[PDB]
Amino acid sequence: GTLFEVVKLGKSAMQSVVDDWIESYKQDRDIALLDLINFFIQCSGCRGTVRIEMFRNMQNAEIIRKMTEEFDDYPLTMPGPQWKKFRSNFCEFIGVLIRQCQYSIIYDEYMMDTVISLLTGLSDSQVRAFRHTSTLAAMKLMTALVNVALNLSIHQDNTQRQYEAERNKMIGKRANERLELLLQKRKELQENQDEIENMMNSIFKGIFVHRYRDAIAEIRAICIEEIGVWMKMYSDAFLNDSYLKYVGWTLHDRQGEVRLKCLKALQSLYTNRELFPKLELFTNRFKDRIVSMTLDKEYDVAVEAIRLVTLILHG
Numbered sequence: 001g002t003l004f005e006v007v008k009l010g011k012s013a014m015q016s017v018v019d020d021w022i023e024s025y026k027q028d029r030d031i032a033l034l035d036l037i038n039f040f041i042q043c044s045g046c047r048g049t050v051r052i053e054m055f056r057n058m059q060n061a062e063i064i065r066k067m068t069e070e071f072d073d074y075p076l077t078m079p080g081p082q083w084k085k086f087r088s089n090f091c092e093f094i095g096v097l098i099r100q101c102q103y104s105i106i107y108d109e110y111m112m113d114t115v116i117s118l119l120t121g122l123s124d125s126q127v128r129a130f131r132h133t134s135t136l137a138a139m140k141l142m143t144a145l146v147n148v149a150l151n152l153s154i155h156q157d158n159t160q161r162q163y164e165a166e167r168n169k170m171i172g173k174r175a176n177e178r179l180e181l182l183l184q185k186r187k188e189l190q191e192n193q194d195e196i197e198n199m200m201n202s203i204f205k206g207i208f209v210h211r212y213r214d215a216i217a218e219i220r221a222i223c224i225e226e227i228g229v230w231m232k233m234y235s236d237a238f239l240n241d242s243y244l245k246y247v248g249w250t251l252h253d254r255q256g257e258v259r260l261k262c263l264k265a266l267q268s269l270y271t272n273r274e275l276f277p278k279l280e281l282f283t284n285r286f287k288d289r290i291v292s293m294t295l296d297k298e299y300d301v302a303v304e305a306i307r308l309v310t311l312i313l314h315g
């Protein structure tokens with residue numbers, strides 16, 4: 001509308017184009033997912049694009065096979081001013097997309113399963129471009145879903161409090177309307193969180209557990225940085241000795257870049273004098289490695305290790 005109306009509503013190109021995409025999904029899911037599929041393809045630097053006859057009538061693996069061939073250095077490795085903000089933007093895009101899809105489209109059983117199936121397939125690819133792009137996307141995707149779970153978690157607690165104050169209000173009395181609605185709200189929200197947890201598991205078992213050991217250091221670096229983000233954000237699901245073994249196993253990684261990340265992640269855990277109890281077995285297991293890394297070889301790795309150890313000392 002008015003210039004004042006658009007300035008007082010900082011909808012950016014991204015949010016604008018996510019809002020357009022959401023509207024295009026409501027008309028025709030197929031073409032919208034087609035456009036979203038082609039987006040991930042184009043972000044890898046792949047020169048081909050999928051048509052609706054392929055999307056409808058080929059099995060993912062086949063689509064990936066055909067896009068593999070059409071591959072002339074990709075947008076994420078590009079240097080120069082016209083790609084400085086690409087990574088940053090690509091990551092924000094995934095966050096905006098899912099933030100916006102989080103209350104309806106995400107729980108449709110078509111949109112997330114389509115994306116995660118693509119990202120999983122692109123993460124198994126011989127092409128570096130594909131492995132790098134999909135994995136980074138999947139790591140930002142997991143974090144987006146974690147933020148969805150945290151939002152349910154709040155709503156689950158308001159619906160929990162509201163049911164308690166209505167179960168108690170009644171007692172001895174026939175279960176009225178507010179009490180059947182709330183007892184329904186509560187199941188719906190938990191069935192939402194199942195579905196989130198599910199997608200998280202598909203992303204973790206399918207993409208993470210394979211990529212965190214990847215040939216390329218940047219891909220190992222992306223996986224570690226993010227498991228560290230999940231473990232801080234959502235302690236109860238991700239902060240456990242099974243998931244932590246991935247971070248420990250990686251402390252022994254060959255690359256400064258990567259060792260640096262494991263320590264940065266563990267740092268942010270140990271600062272919280274609270275999940276400190278839940279790091280007790282992990283610390284006993286890798287004190288020898290954490291501590292050994294204070295004289296690492298790479299100065300800036302060693303610095304971090306020393307900082308980590310001082311943090312472990314203080315608790």
Ligand SMILES: CC(=O)N1CCN(CCCc2ccccc2)CC1
Pocket residue numbers: 037050054055056057058059060061063064114115117118119121
């Ligand atoms: C039932 C069926 O045959 N379909 C087509 C293939 N599926 C592909 C959609 C996601 C995807 C992943 C990897 C490459 C391309 C596309 C969607 C449904």
